Design a protein around this ligand. Structure first.
Ligand SMILES: O=C(O)Cn1cc(Br)c(C2CC2)n1
Ligand SMILES: O=C(O)Cn1cc(Br)c(C2CC2)n1
Ligand SMILES: [Mg+2]
Ligand SMILES: [Mg+2]
Lengths: 546, 546
């Protein structure tokens, strides 16, 4: 029956309520109880506040009216306002004090997730103060999680006027009985109730959520910790840079602040960072999540040498040039991890800081052919399997769904051993035709990859592995250097190929290296442990790249 | 005969030379003359400096070696280094002191422009100091103006070694006699001379330029002030954001720093900002230059109401949302100018600051139909001509080259009077079939527009003018507000439609409005007076949006 949930901003989705700083200021300043609310409300439907909430005047135009109102109320109550009494001041402080009320957001999220239409309906103002960006950030962070945002100052109406609930219903395309509406002010609930909506009077969040859980029959309280926000590909800004005649690179771009360039591994996609993109943008960074050469909407030339680290790096430098970026932070995973280390070593002036997930920095051994280094570790056998052009292409391209469903698995779910892959004749010789879905991925997500890999297949991706000798030789040039810019190595306990201990000597080459470590996490780090990854990158970004 | 010009960075394209801070420090500190150069050069082809210039070690690895060298030299010369003597310090200061030597750059530019291949060949280092971004910015700013940049620490060779000149020649695809090479160190010139290249020993810039002028037979000295850097469209980052199902917006994106959204007028293009894009990126801003709805690579739905200011504004807000931008500075021209004022008035929380070129802010007159306001001013007659769907489309689309060549003209070149356009039956009824090129535009540039307008024609663009009543009504809602965020109005003396005096009352609505004014400039402001526009926007950005 109930099919839509409507939340207010002040006192419901965001706390402490700004209305409530009137009360607190009165106490703090020993003013007559209610004096400030009286001034805030003076003239009712015709006073300054209502004009403000209706969008007739801006906040800065309103501030002096409220001032005058406060003086009127203090005269009539035969008291004085303190020296330095400042409405601008009180409101600047209250508006920045207000934060998202996380449990209310997650309940709205869960309801949206079980099929509800969700809306914010709020009495709010046109904000033109010096410090307005603060409110603009909050609204941006909230509005994305809801179907609609209805703001009194944009529609020219205000709660409790009946017309705005009529507008609400009309916006929702629902009848009154299908809607639950939550508000911290009872007077605002009343016209929703008149129409026969379920209403919830929000005092403490937990009680309100109990009421909401009861009435919708969905669990909202005591729910497991949810995944971070993901990315819907068709809501992203898609960017395209031609770095040379036959090579253009695609990336997705979110946020502002220092530039953070995300570099995925084999055989993945920008979308491999879908959990980190909003989190890092939210944390104050300009995230550029690439399709690396060979992938997705980037160019995929056929020749092997187009994919040697030297050419790949120079292309990433050009990509910075053409975007007008003097540096970026480079964060990589798997092959992307390898590339960012080399960016640190050959272009430190372009790298604000470097981090790798799973991929350790190992210097070339000048006395040992790289092919032999690889034959030393049985778990790298899959890399020899990738050498002969066509062989791996045929297996990986035969059945795309099957490929990604077999590869993208958590530590406890794996179906393919990297063990004697050449000998067995292939990577999937002993895995199902129809693999079960890993807990890490949905069917929709697997299909995104499938669709990406239909444009170019696996020749470009595989070529990344086909320049061992060439990379070795270019790497030998850097054996005298150290990496001395800010640097983070994140090891993944259950990555049975890029094992943690493979990173154990890195400090000899990177003396001030910082570490994070993630337990119970396999090779597909970002999707396996997205919360831990986000926490480790943001903490490291905030302290080292800023 | 001469077909290529090769410039060094230190002492030639950039001044003061860092080599020269060794000399100055010696004097400042009363050290033995040459003591620091001796330490810098110690061990010659096998000392630390050469290893550095070859890319064997990074700058920060080198710093302690130079330190040790300085101590060695002071011992042997039986002197003391002062307390607090610091190579890190001396080099941090010298490297930031160094700036582009503008007259050398403009000569390289002019030579490139007359057909030369141009290169930078420099002995330089891998820079990993905390303050490396400074050097990275310089190199970015220089490297874009040349065909090649050859850096000793990337190719593993150094001037004066013969092999690097061989590499140079090979990179240029020219023989030695076709090349002029300039350097401030004679020893570096010598192997170029051995090969039969023209060399110039650069001491003062002006004398070097005289030599270069003589030997190439091109004027380099005393040349008129050149246009600002323009944009080559296929070197830009192209961005695409879907703001709703049938509407995607395209923009070009350059630089980092605060977000600056450029909004063009009718009937133009992102490319209408080609002169401002590099200048504003260079000044430390993240420039997003749009194709506005209706244009270029943005969507162009046919319905008139898709182009009313309300819908246009809401779409620009969504565009910020999807890019994760809480605000941007909005700068508009002509119709774009109108749109940014309305962004200021309905979304001040999203606008860091607002500026308009030519378009004044005029409030709706609540007592006068907007069609009548327009019939009041004979110079707006062209706007009535634009009302009837199809009529203007047919004339403007008949011959695209002719259209843009007729419209894009400087104040003294105009062929079309906005005077009684309806009566004459059209905007071009009394202009040539083949108009001459305006001084403001090349044939190539006109063709870019032509090509842009072949995708959607003029229906979308013209629809911007077809919502007078609808815009009037939405504008009436804002008649109580003022614009109180940072705001700049730039008037164009010879814009005979958007005349300066049309802005004369703006201060009543925008009390702290700032102004710039440009003389001898018609309607096509950005291309007419690109230097003045750049100077006025950057000065206003730096003081009001930062
Ligand atoms: O290591 C694992 O957990 C599973 N795995 C599958 C592949 Br392909 C790899 C290579 C590191 C890229 N690892
Ligand atoms: O005013 C001028 O200088 C020439 N001109 C041509 C046109 Br269409 C216009 C309208 C302001 C857009 N002006
Ligand atoms: Mg409330
Ligand atoms: Mg020099």
């Amino acid at each position: 029956t109930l099919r839509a949930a409507v939340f207010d901003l002040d006192g419901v989705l965001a706390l402490p309520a700004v209305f409530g700083v009137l009360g607190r200021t009165e106490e703090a300043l020993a003013l007559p109880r209610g004096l400030l609310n009286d001034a805030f409300q003076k003239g009712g439907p015709e006073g300054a506040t209502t004009r403000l909430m209706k969008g007739e005047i801006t906040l800065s135009q309103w501030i002096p009216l409220m001032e005058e109102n406060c003086r009127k109320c203090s005269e009539t109550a035969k008291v004085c306002l303190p020296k330095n009494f400042s409405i601008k001041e009180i409101f600047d402080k209250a508006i920045s004090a207000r934060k998202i009320n996380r449990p209310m957001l997650q309940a709205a999220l869960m309801l949206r997730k079980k099929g509800f239409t969700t809306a914010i309906l709020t009495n709010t103002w046109l904000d033109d103060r010096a410090e307005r960006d603060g409110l603009a950030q909050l609204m941006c962070e909230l509005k994305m999680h809801f179907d609609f945002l209805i703001e009194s100052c944009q529609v020219g109406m205000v709660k409790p006027e009946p017309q705005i609930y009529k507008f609400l219903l009309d916006t929702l395309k629902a009848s009154p009985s299908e809607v639950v509406f939550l508000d911290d002010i009872g007077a605002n609930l009343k016209p929703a109730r008149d129409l026969g909506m379920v209403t919830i009077l929000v005092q403490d969040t937990d009680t309100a959520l109990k009421e909401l859980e009861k009435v919708t029959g969905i669990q909202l309280l005591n729910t497991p910790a949810p995944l971070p926000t993901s990315c819907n590909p068709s809501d992203m800004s898609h960017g395209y840079v031609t770095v040379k005649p036959r090579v253009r690179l695609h990336f997705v771009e979110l946020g502002s602040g220092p530039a953070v360039c995300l570099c995925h591994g084999f055989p993945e996609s920008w979308y491999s960072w879908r959990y980190q993109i909003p989190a890092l943008a939210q944390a104050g960074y300009r995230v550029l999540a690439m399709d690396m050469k060979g992938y997705g909407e980037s160019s995929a030339p056929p020749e092997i040498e187009e994919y040697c680290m030297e050419v790949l790096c120079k292309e990433m430098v050009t990509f910075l040039d053409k975007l007008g970026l003097s540096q970026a932070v480079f964060i990589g995973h798997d092959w992307g991890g390898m590339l960012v280390w080399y960016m640190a070593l050959f272009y430190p002036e372009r790298v604000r800081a470097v981090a790798s997930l799973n991929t350790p920095f190992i210097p070339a051994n000048p006395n040992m052919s790289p092919l032999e280094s690889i034959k030393a570790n049985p778990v790298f056998d899959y890399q020899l399997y990738f050498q002969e052009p066509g062989v791996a292409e045929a297996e990986l391209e035969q059945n795309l769904s099957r490929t990604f469903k077999s590869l993208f698995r958590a530590s406890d779910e794996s179906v393919l051993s990297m063990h004697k892959v050449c000998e067995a004749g292939g990577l999937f010789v002993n895995s199902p035709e129809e693999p079960s879905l890993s807990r890490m991925v949905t069917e929709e997500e697997i299909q995104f990859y499938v669709q990406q890999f239909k444009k170019s297949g696996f020749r470009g991706p595989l070529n990344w592995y086909r320049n061992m000798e060439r990379n070795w030789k270019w790497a030998c040039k850097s054996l005298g250097r150290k990496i001395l810019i800010p640097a983070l190595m994140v090891t993944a306990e259950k990555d049975f190929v890029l094992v943690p201990q493979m990173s154990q000597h890195m400090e000899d080459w990177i003396p001030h290296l910082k570490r994070g470590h993630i337990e119970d996490c396999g090779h597909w780090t970002q999707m396996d442990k997205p919360t831990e990854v986000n926490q480790i990158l943001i903490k490291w970004l905030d302290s080292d790249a800023r």
